[PDB]
RNA sequence: GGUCUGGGCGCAGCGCAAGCUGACGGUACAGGCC
């Protein structure tokens, strides 16, 4: 893995949870 | 309407050296399919 991948990935998790949380 | 992957740039912080990191930027950028 790399910082970007983690960043790119993490952004998914956070944002993904965003839909659920917001939803 | 949805899903999956990640690469590099800036800034900041720590150190005899070397070396890493930030639910930060970036809700950014890119590509594919149903």
mmCIF file of C-alpha atoms (C1' of nucleotides) in Angstrom:
data_model
loop_
_atom_site.group_PDB
_atom_site.id
_atom_site.type_symbol
_atom_site.label_atom_id
_atom_site.label_comp_id
_atom_site.label_asym_id
_atom_site.label_seq_id
_atom_site.Cartn_x
_atom_site.Cartn_y
_atom_site.Cartn_z
ATOM 1 C CA UNK A 1 0.000 0.000 0.000
ATOM 2 C CA UNK A 2 0.877 3.712 -0.193
ATOM 3 C CA UNK A 3 -0.273 6.942 1.449
ATOM 4 C CA UNK A 4 -2.263 7.872 -1.658
ATOM 5 C CA UNK A 5 -3.998 4.479 -1.816
ATOM 6 C CA UNK A 6 -4.839 4.788 1.880
ATOM 7 C CA UNK A 7 -5.907 8.402 1.340
ATOM 8 C CA UNK A 8 -7.888 7.508 -1.785
ATOM 9 C CA UNK A 9 -9.278 4.464 0.026
ATOM 10 C CA UNK A 10 -9.914 6.249 3.330
ATOM 11 C CA UNK A 11 -11.766 9.003 1.475
ATOM 12 C CA UNK A 12 -14.030 6.214 0.225
ATOM 13 C CA UNK A 13 -14.659 4.814 3.706
ATOM 14 C CA UNK A 14 -15.278 8.232 5.241
ATOM 15 C CA UNK A 15 -17.438 9.408 2.337
ATOM 16 C CA UNK A 16 -19.121 6.008 2.067
ATOM 17 C CA UNK A 17 -20.049 6.154 5.758
ATOM 18 C CA UNK A 18 -21.157 9.678 4.859
ATOM 19 C CA UNK A 19 -24.041 8.395 2.741
ATOM 20 C CA UNK A 20 -25.034 5.907 5.443
ATOM 21 C CA UNK A 21 -24.568 8.422 8.256
ATOM 22 C CA UNK A 22 -26.294 11.214 6.337
ATOM 23 C CA UNK A 23 -28.747 8.656 4.962
ATOM 24 C "C1'" G B 1 -28.006 5.567 -10.338
ATOM 25 C "C1'" G B 2 -24.248 2.563 -8.283
ATOM 26 C "C1'" U B 3 -19.474 0.252 -7.360
ATOM 27 C "C1'" C B 4 -14.134 -0.719 -7.209
ATOM 28 C "C1'" U B 5 -8.772 0.808 -7.357
ATOM 29 C "C1'" G B 6 -4.993 4.296 -6.672
ATOM 30 C "C1'" G B 7 -1.113 7.754 -8.050
ATOM 31 C "C1'" G B 8 1.482 12.456 -7.252
ATOM 32 C "C1'" C B 9 1.470 17.467 -5.273
ATOM 33 C "C1'" G B 10 1.532 21.006 -1.312
ATOM 34 C "C1'" C B 11 1.796 22.269 3.655
ATOM 35 C "C1'" A B 12 3.011 21.018 8.503
ATOM 36 C "C1'" G B 13 5.455 18.077 12.435
ATOM 37 C "C1'" C B 14 9.812 15.050 14.548
ATOM 38 C "C1'" G B 15 15.631 13.981 14.192
ATOM 39 C "C1'" C B 16 23.331 13.507 15.378
ATOM 40 C "C1'" A B 17 21.208 10.097 10.987
ATOM 41 C "C1'" A B 18 17.825 7.700 8.593
ATOM 42 C "C1'" G B 19 12.740 7.710 8.142
ATOM 43 C "C1'" C B 20 7.485 8.008 8.406
ATOM 44 C "C1'" U B 21 2.870 10.382 9.135
ATOM 45 C "C1'" G B 22 -1.881 13.786 9.200
ATOM 46 C "C1'" A B 23 -11.349 10.617 9.438
ATOM 47 C "C1'" C B 24 -5.741 17.188 6.104
ATOM 48 C "C1'" G B 25 -6.385 19.714 1.430
ATOM 49 C "C1'" G B 26 -9.202 16.204 -1.462
ATOM 50 C "C1'" U B 27 -17.002 16.226 -1.216
ATOM 51 C "C1'" A B 28 -9.820 17.005 -5.426
ATOM 52 C "C1'" C B 29 -7.825 14.043 -10.048
ATOM 53 C "C1'" A B 30 -8.208 9.467 -13.343
ATOM 54 C "C1'" G B 31 -10.222 4.874 -15.447
ATOM 55 C "C1'" G B 32 -13.757 0.792 -16.294
ATOM 56 C "C1'" C B 33 -18.511 -1.652 -16.155
ATOM 57 C "C1'" C B 34 -23.579 -2.794 -15.148
#
